[PDB]
Design a protein around this ligand. Sequence first.
Ligand SMILES: CCCCCCCCCCCO[C@@H]1O[C@H](CO)[C@@H](O[C@H]2O[C@H](CO)[C@@H](O)[C@H](O)[C@H]2O)[C@H](O)[C@H]1O
Lengths: 431, 47
Amino acid sequence: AEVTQLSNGIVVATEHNPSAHTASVGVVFGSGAANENPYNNGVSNLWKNIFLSKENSAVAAKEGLALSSNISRDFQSYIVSSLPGSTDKSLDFLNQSFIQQKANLLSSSNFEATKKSVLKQVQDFEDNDHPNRVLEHLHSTAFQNTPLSLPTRGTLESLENLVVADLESFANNHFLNSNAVVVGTGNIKHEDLVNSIESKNLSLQTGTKPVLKKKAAFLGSEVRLRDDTLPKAWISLAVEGEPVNSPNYFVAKLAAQIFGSYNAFEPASRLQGIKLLDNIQEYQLCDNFNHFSLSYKDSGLWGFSTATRNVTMIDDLIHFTLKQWNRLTISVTDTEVERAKSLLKLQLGQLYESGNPVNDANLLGAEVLIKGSKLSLGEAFKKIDAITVKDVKAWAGKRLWDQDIAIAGTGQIEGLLDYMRIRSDMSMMRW
Amino acid sequence: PEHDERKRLGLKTVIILSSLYLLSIWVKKFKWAGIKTRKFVFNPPKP
Ligand SMILES: CCCCCCCCCCCO[C@@H]1O[C@H](CO)[C@@H](O[C@H]2O[C@H](CO)[C@@H](O)[C@H](O)[C@H]2O)[C@H](O)[C@H]1O
């Protein structure tokens, strides 16, 4: 992970990789679902889909280019992939699609079909993707009536009320130069991509700043979507976590790594050095779980998600997990922190250094849009190696011990007890 | 003969219990706040 960034109005950032074999060029905006309203919610997912439209994709396919678009909470990306030399043609397609096709892609035939696609797409997700649907409701109840609560794909209600005018108004306010970063990852060199950008000119949609509003706030609450027809109980629970640029960003991630992820069906997963495993395998409290330390611009979420068929012992699953979390404040051991350090590094490694250029493009853009430059692993590893048991305890003492929680769940959740019973387990009795 | 002493202890007992009673109500309302304001919504499932 090595960065290089320059500017001339349009901020350009790249990251060379001599052993790439391909290259990805694109634009990333510092506005995602958290920059939408409860009524135009889904407008970004809508943009993503028209950019990947059938027509637009053919025009790129003939050019030997592959398209990619990712909608998140804080950022939004549109990336083009090609061979290392065809990079000059990728920028032409980008310039063509976002500085000329302001009405090409927004035709009544293309739009109504795309709208129809994302509509069925989202209907399916809400209908069958239980673990992600639950996790989305977790964000929805935790940050309710606040920016961070809106689902990245949007709601079926506001999705079907959208018109080309909604797409345009969003573009006019967010697809601006001051809210973007041109990204180039793969094998291409920095002092070469900027030239092709300087080769052209104009300034259509510039000078203007994006809009502002209220900041994300965590609220202790819950949303229960009971469905007895499903074969499992899917739940997600979390406390208010850390925002990107928080002093405890790495400490929180190390804490999540301590409890990690688990798949009851994979032999090696059952053997991990996570004390919680000794409590949940006796009666097989779940099929799987995974801890997380989600971080965004305004706030974060630290917690876990689980899936279980043991619908009569959900109280034990929750009880044991939260009881292990208490340990982070009062008894986490040195070895537990050292095992977490090793594995956090490993995960940060697989994330920041995959052989995939589109992954690096999204990470580069989204990061420079906040801190001004992507963080190197070498520095990340140094901060991770410096984390002490005390750091973890001090952190747990403020974000975990006797703190409000956000819960969401669907399926056979009758066995999931009331809020207070769950909230109580966030601390222990003592003299 | 216990009259005087009986009434003195009665004052003590009744002040403590009156306090205990009001305290218990406040505490009860707090532990029930989440249930008392719980909201429900029905969306007829698709057949
Ligand atoms: C039979 C008649 C006899 C009656 C005797 C009365 C008993 C009184 C017990 C009083 C307090 O016992 C005390 O309770 C509080 C919760 O209220 C516990 O607190 C625990 O939960 C609270 C949250 O609600 C956390 O903030 C706290 O960090 C945690 O330690 C504390 O650790 C325990 O020591």
